[PDB]
Amino acid sequence: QKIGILGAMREEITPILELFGVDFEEIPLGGNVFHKGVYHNKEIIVAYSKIGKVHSTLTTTSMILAFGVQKVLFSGVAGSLVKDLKINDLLVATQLVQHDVDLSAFDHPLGFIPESAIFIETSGSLNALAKKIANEQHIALKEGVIASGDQFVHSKERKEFLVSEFKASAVEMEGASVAFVCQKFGVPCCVLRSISDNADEKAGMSFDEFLEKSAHTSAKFLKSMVDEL
Amino acid sequence: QKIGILGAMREEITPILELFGVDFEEIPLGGNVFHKGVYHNKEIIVAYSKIGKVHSTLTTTSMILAFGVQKVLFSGVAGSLVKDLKINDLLVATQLVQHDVDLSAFDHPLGFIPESAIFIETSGSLNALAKKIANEQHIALKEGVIASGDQFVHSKERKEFLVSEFKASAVEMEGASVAFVCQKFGVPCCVLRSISDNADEKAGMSFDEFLEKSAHTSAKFLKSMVDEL
Numbered sequence: 001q002k003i004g005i006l007g008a009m010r011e012e013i014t015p016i017l018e019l020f021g022v023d024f025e026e027i028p029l030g031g032n033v034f035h036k037g038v039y040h041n042k043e044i045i046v047a048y049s050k051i052g053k054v055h056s057t058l059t060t061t062s063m064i065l066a067f068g069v070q071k072v073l074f075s076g077v078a079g080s081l082v083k084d085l086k087i088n089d090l091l092v093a094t095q096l097v098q099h100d101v102d103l104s105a106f107d108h109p110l111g112f113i114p115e116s117a118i119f120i121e122t123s124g125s126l127n128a129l130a131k132k133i134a135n136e137q138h139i140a141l142k143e144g145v146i147a148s149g150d151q152f153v154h155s156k157e158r159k160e161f162l163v164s165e166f167k168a169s170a171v172e173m174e175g176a177s178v179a180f181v182c183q184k185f186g187v188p189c190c191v192l193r194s195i196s197d198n199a200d201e202k203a204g205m206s207f208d209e210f211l212e213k214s215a216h217t218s219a220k221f222l223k224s225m226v227d228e229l
Numbered sequence: 230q231k232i233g234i235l236g237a238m239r240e241e242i243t244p245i246l247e248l249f250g251v252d253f254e255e256i257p258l259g260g261n262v263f264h265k266g267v268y269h270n271k272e273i274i275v276a277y278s279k280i281g282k283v284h285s286t287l288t289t290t291s292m293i294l295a296f297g298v299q300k301v302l303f304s305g306v307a308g309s310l311v312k313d314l315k316i317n318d319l320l321v322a323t324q325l326v327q328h329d330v331d332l333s334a335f336d337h338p339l340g341f342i343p344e345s346a347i348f349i350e351t352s353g354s355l356n357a358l359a360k361k362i363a364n365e366q367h368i369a370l371k372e373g374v375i376a377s378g379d380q381f382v383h384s385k386e387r388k389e390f391l392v393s394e395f396k397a398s399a400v401e402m403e404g405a406s407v408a409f410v411c412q413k414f415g416v417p418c419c420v421l422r423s424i425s426d427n428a429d430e431k432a433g434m435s436f437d438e439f440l441e442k443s444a445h446t447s448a449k450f451l452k453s454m455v456d457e458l
């Protein structure tokens with residue numbers, strides 16, 4: 001079995017590599033470094049994409065085409081858009097949207113591109129596994145919509161737009177693109193985020209403070225999912 | 230050799246398929262249909278990505294990893310940001326930027342993502358070929374910066390931002406992401422656009438009127454380049 005594990009930043013995959021604690025071969029391709037290891041009966045391929053939609057689209061496509069991963073699990077951090085998502089809380093994305101897509105000039109709904117859809121779904125199977133583990137381990141896992149775009153959101157006005165337009169609970173910069181690629185290749189995908197900030201005026205400072213811890217929270221949970229695969 | 234040829238829309242590649250006039254094999258992959266043909270001892274792979282950065286990133290990566298193309302030529306339409314670029318005019322991109330990338334919360338310049346760059350360059354050799362053909366055929370080929378993002382621009386305010394911030398001459402939704410993927414894999418890339426609109430309040434109407442004609446103008450030029458490869 002081959003499992004792809006993705007983060008956006010080095011900080012998000014360092015805990016992952018450490019948690020598995022196996023030897024990894026480093027393989028460069030398309031401007032990324034892939035870490036290939038064997039963990040029990042599974043081949044694991046770990047990489048960070050670098051930030052944003054284009055980066056994450058390329059890395060996920062490489063993981064699937066060049067390494068043949070049969071599942072993709074993404075772990076990282078995000079901004080909270082709703083009161084009951086607190087710093088360090090975990091969210092599993094059930095649907096994702098690209099919130100910065102705008103073809104309204106042609107009277108398309110926001111987030112929509114012809115020959116596509118506004119919302120992408122993730123793996124029912126992996127999401128159920130996440131919920132099962134969280135219930136068993138007394139972890140307060142939330143689920144809901146994640147909005148992805150190529151801007152770091154640090155504005156009350158944008159937060160209000162995301163909730164009202166897309167019913168999003170969190171905002172980040174890679175989830176929708178990773179899940180889109182996986183869907184096009186028929187590869188099950190799970191997107192896990194731990195809250196690092198509130199996507200508001202001081203989100204940058206909060207992100208700087210909490211990146212390491214929030215990244216660890218996500219990584220540890222992702223590791224527990226792989227242990228059950 | 231193996232040449233990849235890309236457009237964003239069906240309208241942009243139908244002229245290309247007709248121009249080559251050979252039999253193509255249709256090969257589905259990653260939600261795209263790739264048209265594989267042989268033309269004067271060159272293997273040509275033609276596809277349209279569908280609109281936007283994620284779509285075009287995926288398609289370009291598939292073309293390179295799954296088909297092994299050695300160069301990529303992109304043909305399509307764009308909005309003009311400057312007075313001397315008129316509807317139907319041809320532009321070859323010298324550099325491209327993702328104009329909607331915003332990590333200003335971390336004090337990064339607009340368009341910049343850490344571990345990347347604001348501007349991406351295109352193929353010196355292909356751009357020179359384009360210029361030689363234009364000169365030989367007495368075609369008024371322009372060169373300049375192209376800004377790419379996931380919005381159809383139809384606003385004087387946004388036009389002013391693009392010209393001021395990035396010194397862009399035209400705006401579209403795929404160029405920067407195609408050239409980005411090509412650079413990461415070391416694949417020479419040329420991006421050609423024919424102007425379909427002025428990226429202003431009436432841009433949607435202009436695009437609707439001129440998409441087909443402008444798409445044909447760009448396709449014919451791309452064909453001329455492949456004929457010299």
Ligand SMILES: Nc1ncnc2c([C@@H]3O[C@H](CO)[C@@H](O)[C@H]3O)n[nH]c12
Nearest residue numbers: 008077078079152153172173174199
């Ligand atoms: N408020 C916010 N807005 C957008 N992205 C993020 C993120 C995630 O952290 C990184 C911030 O650039 C990026 O990978 C994104 O996915 N955290 N908080 C965010």
Ligand SMILES: Nc1ncnc2c([C@@H]3O[C@H](CO)[C@@H](O)[C@H]3O)n[nH]c12
Nearest residue numbers: 237306307308381382401402403428
């Ligand atoms: N004013 C404009 N703004 C953004 N993109 C475009 C385009 C191109 O045409 C398509 C418009 O959806 C898309 O593929 C884009 O690359 N034409 N005019 C444009």
